[PDB]
Every structure is written in C-alpha cells, then in structure tokens.
Design a protein around this ligand. Structure first.
Ligand code: HEM
Length: 153
C-alpha cells in the first residue's frame, strides 16, 4: 500500500488535475490513442477520429476525458479503500468494453506523461513516485478482478 505521506502527495498532485479536468482528460486520451492506435478501436464513438487534430477538436472526447478522470479521482480519494468504486469499473471494462490490462498500463503511463507535459518542473520525484504507486495499486486491483473473470482480452 501507500503510506499516509504518499497519499498526501497523490492528492496534492491531483489538485493540478482538478483545476482543469477536461484538459487533462483530453490530453490523457489523446496520448493513449496516438501512442497506441489499437486502443482507439475499442471506442466505437472515437474510431472516426483519423487525426490528432480531429481528436483535439472533439468535444465528445473531452467529455469522456472528464468522465474518466472524475472516476479515477473518486477512486484515488478513497486512498486504497476503493473496492465498491473499483469493482464495477473493472467488471465493465472486462466484460462490456473488453479492455486488456495492457491498455490500463498504457493509460497509467499516459497520465504520468501528461502531468510532466502540463507541469514541467512542478511534478517532482517524490510526487511521481507516489502517483505511480497509486496508479499501480489501481491497475493491480483491477487485475485481480480480471483474473476472477478469467478475462485476458
Ligand atoms: C484510468 C483508467 C480508466 C477509467 C477511470 C475509466 C473510466 C470509465 C468510465 C467511468 C466509463 C463509463 C462507465 C462504464 O462504462 O463503466 C468508461 C467507459 C468506457 N471505457 Fe474506460 N476508463 C479507463 C480506462 C480505459 C481504457 C484504457 C480504455 C480502452 C483502451 C477504456 C475504454 C472504455 C470504453 C470503450 C468505454 C465505453 C465508452 C462509451 O462508448 O461511452 N477505458 N470508462
């Protein structure tokens, strides 16, 4: 788990995201889609986006970014006590959306990238460490739910 100090760092970093949830969410999804085009194919409603310019101009993509980061933020604020929040997300992502855990790794990495991109010099080594642990815990708890379901891809 994370220490109390680590959780405080995570939620301090999260304040940056909360100042511009839509902008952070958009950039995270664009980073995901451009770095890993296979991920776009899981989204019937984003498949039509043929260029990054189109992605940037998509108001629905920004909207989904808000949905994604709002859900993640609610989970992070539980500081690991997130079974009720996380279980349904894991199950919808496995059973309905068919999202391999690899893609959760990709989006976790995208979040770290976007934080540095939007806040260069203001996302310190301790902060990166703590946020990485939180995202690993999130991913790992999802992975346990995936194993329960026998879901791979
Ligand atoms: C931080 C990690 C993620 C969070 C917090 C998150 C959150 C959400 C939420 C709240 C929804 C709407 C409710 C639901 O269907 O459960 C959703 C829908 C969806 N998610 Fe995720 N998600 C994450 C990662 C991913 C990734 C990596 C992919 C694919 C590469 C993905 C694919 C989808 C798809 C296809 C939908 C349905 C979208 C629609 O057509 O409305 N998610 N996600």
């Amino acid at each position: 788990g994370l220490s109390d100090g680590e959780w405080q760092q995570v939620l301090n970093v999260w304040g940056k995201v909360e100042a511009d949830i839509a902008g952070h969410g958009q950039e995270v999804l664009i980073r995901l889609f451009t770095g890993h085009p296979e991920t776009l194919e899981k989204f019937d409603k984003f498949k039509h986006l043929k260029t990054e310019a189109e992605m940037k101009a998509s108001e629905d993509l920004k909207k989904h970014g808000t949905v994604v980061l709002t859900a993640l933020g609610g989970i992070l604020k539980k500081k690991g006590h997130h079974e009720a929040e996380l279980k349904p997300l894991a199950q919808s992502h496995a059973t309905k959306h068919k999202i391999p855990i690899k893609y959760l790794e990709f989006i976790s990495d995208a979040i770290i990238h976007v934080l540095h991109s939007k806040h260069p010099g203001d996302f310190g080594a301790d902060a990166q460490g703590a946020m990485t642990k939180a995202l690993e815990l999130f991913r790992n708890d999802i992975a346990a739910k995936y194993k329960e379901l026998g879901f791979q891809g």
